[PDB]
Design a protein around this ligand. Structure first.
Ligand SMILES: Nc1nc2c(ncn2[C@@H]2O[C@H](COP(=O)(O)OP(=O)(O)O)[C@@H](O)[C@H]2O)c(=O)[nH]1
Ligand SMILES: [Mg+2]
Lengths: 148, 339, 50, 46
């Protein structure tokens, strides 16, 4: 549509593209000490070879480190979802409270919309969990790993 | 009967969890000798508040109600003391007031924190604030009015807080300070509820029909009229039951209020507040439902064995034995081989 | 191959596999929690229906 | 006419984008099945 706010703001749900370009920041806010990674790998190897003498590096020493690293990203995804919900609520308020002079109507039309939004919060979080859970279920080395 | 929101509060207490309902703070703002402090007494249902003509509410009182199976009160400044006779709670409030403000009609912004436990109360926060005045007396400083407003603004300018504007009936409504404050902080009327507290003392020949019908100063949520206990009745320790019966008789008899009789009095105010709170938690429930369902999903898979538990069940014992022996053999093999 | 055969040979098979007190207390607490939790969801249901 | 130059450009972008989609599908289909059909079966058996 027309009548865009060319001067005053960067706004009107274009903030959500910042979350989609801000979540790539949360995914790298996390850091680890390499010495703990090395210690954990050493113990993973020593714990995979239980009594046997090792000839080749076991493949579970890779898988059990990757799963442990992958479990860390559950939190920032939920933070992203909550931020998106916050922006939807703010947008509904702008489209409801500022343009309507009738009492009671601007309450029903905000309450109903934000209730529907919260229910979709529920469904969205379930789908995010069923995506990260899938990332753990299988290790795929076919597409872009360091091919020998 | 108990309203459904109290049924939820009972169930949440009954499950020993920290999940709870998010309810607004309720502030009652009036004016000097308006009677605001006497309204909370009837709302809560226990005659523990200090009362009487003059400067009686000197410090803001923060009263928190908690749902519990034992009825009692506690103070933060009286640690470990379980009060069961509220007529000593009154004395502790007066003593704590005098300890800080002094006896010469002083005030202080520091609140008194009281917690009351009872079986069918929500987790509401109630604030009894000192009334506004124009003329300083009793060594109060010349700016007493501004300090009182400064105390009020820290409770009535917050969001998610209801404002009950208490105005007397015998004093012309245009002079009411509570309506001025509510108007300043709630221009739209979404949060303000008005109450007319002294219809008993109207000058003979007049009435307040033009106020209770929301015509003289239209307010979005209307006005509720009440009749409270007079100074003599409190000095005579008249039972709350008699006061409520007298109020009902007053409204039924008075020729100018019969058609409003079913919208007035303390219990109607209770119904209105319950409806406002009930409509305040809508659009919050989906989160509680999702958390409760998640816990049920994580318990239901296990409690199936418990529901049919019997002290004599050889099949349950046999299968438990087989599963534990299997788990032992597998755990030992994994632990020593490393597989 | 043998462990279960030996377990069937121990004691009198009457006191073996007898629950401790702690499991009984946990059972009671879990059943109480289950029933109260279902009640809470019933009340939320009724409130949303009105 | 210059319109043909626009059409060719769109085609190239579509092919590029579709390549990315193909990778995702190839990646997510194995992982999905392992999660829902094979690992639930092992957990059932054990
Ligand atoms: N007759 C009559 N007196 C009332 C009524 N409401 C309040 N009062 C009197 O007004 C006094 C002052 O109100 P109070 O309860 O002290 O709270 P305040 O507004 O902080 O002074 C009360 O103590 C009562 O004696 C009423 O409905 N009828
Ligand atoms: Mg007072």
């Amino acid at each position: 549509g027309d009548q865009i706010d060319t001067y005053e703001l960067s706004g009107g749900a274009r903030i959500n593209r910042i979350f989609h370009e801000r979540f790539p920041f949360e995914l790298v806010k996390m850091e680890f000490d390499e010495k703990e990674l090395r210690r954990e790998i050493s113990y993973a190897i020593k714990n995979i070879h239980g009594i046997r003498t090792g000839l080749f590096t076991p493949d579970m020493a890779f898988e059990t480190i990757v799963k442990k690293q992958v479990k860390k990203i559950r939190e920032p995804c939920l933070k992203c979802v909550d931020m998106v919900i916050s922006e939807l609520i703010s947008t509904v308020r702008q489209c409801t409270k500022k343009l309507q002079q009738y009492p009671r109507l601007r309450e029903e039309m905000e309450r109903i919309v934000t209730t529907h939004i919260r229910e979709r919060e529920g469904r969205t979080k379930e789908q995010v969990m069923l995506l990260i859970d899938i990332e753990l279920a299988y290790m795929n080395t076919n597409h872009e790993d360091f091919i020998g | 009967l108990i309203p459904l929101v109290n049924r939820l509060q009972d169930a949440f207490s009954a499950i020993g969890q920290n999940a709870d309902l998010d309810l607004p703070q309720i502030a009652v703002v009036g004016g000097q000798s308006a009677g605001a402090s006497s309204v909370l007494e009837n709302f809560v249902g226990r005659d523990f508040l200090p009362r009487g003509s003059g400067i009686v509410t000197r410090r803001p009182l923060v009263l928190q109600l908690v749902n519990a199976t034992t009825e009692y009160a506690e103070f933060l400044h009286c640690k470990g003391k379980k009060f069961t006779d509220f007529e000593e709670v009154r004395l502790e409030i007066e003593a704590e007031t005098d300890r800080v403000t002094g006896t010469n009609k002083g005030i202080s912004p520091v609140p008194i924190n009281l917690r009351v436990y009872s079986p069918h109360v929500l987790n509401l926060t109630l604030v009894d604030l000192p009334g506004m005045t124009k003329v300083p007396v009793g060594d109060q400083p010349p700016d007493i009015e501004f300090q009182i407003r400064d105390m009020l603004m820290q409770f009535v300018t917050k969001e998610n807080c209801l404002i009950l504007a208490v105005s007397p009936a015998n004093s012309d409504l245009a002079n009411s300070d509570a309506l001025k404050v509510a108007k300043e902080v709630d221009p739209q009327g979404q949060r303000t509820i008005g109450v007319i507290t002294k219809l008993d003392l109207m000058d003979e020949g007049t009435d307040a029909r033009d106020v209770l019908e929301n015509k003289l100063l239209p307010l979005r949520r209307g006005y509720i009229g009440v009749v409270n206990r007079s100074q003599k009745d409190i000095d005579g320790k008249k039972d709350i039951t008699a006061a409520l019966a007298a109020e009902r008789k007053f409204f039924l008899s008075h020729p100018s209020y019969r058609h409003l009789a079913d919208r007035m009095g303390t219990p109607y105010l209770q119904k209105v507040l319950n409806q406002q709170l009930t409509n305040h938690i809508r659009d919050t429930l989906p989160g509680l439902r999702n958390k409760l369902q998640s816990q049920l999903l994580s318990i239901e898979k296990e409690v199936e064995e418990y529901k049919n538990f019997r002290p004599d069940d050889p099949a349950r014992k046999t299968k438990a034995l087989l599963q534990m022996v299997q788990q032992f053999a597998v755990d030992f093999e994994k632990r020593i081989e490393g597989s | 191959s043998e462990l279960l055969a030996n377990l069937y040979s121990c004691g009198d098979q009457n006191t073996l596999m007898e629950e401790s007190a702690e499991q009984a207390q946990r059972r009671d607490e879990m059943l109480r929690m289950y029933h109260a939790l279902k009640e809470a969801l019933s009340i939320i249901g009724n409130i949303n229906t009105t | 006419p210059q319109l043909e130059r626009q059409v060719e450009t769109i085609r190239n972008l579509v092919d590029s984008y579709m390549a990315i989609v193909n990778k995702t599908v190839r990646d997510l289909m194995p992982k999905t099945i392992m999660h829902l059909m094979i690992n639930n079966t092992k957990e059932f058996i054990f």
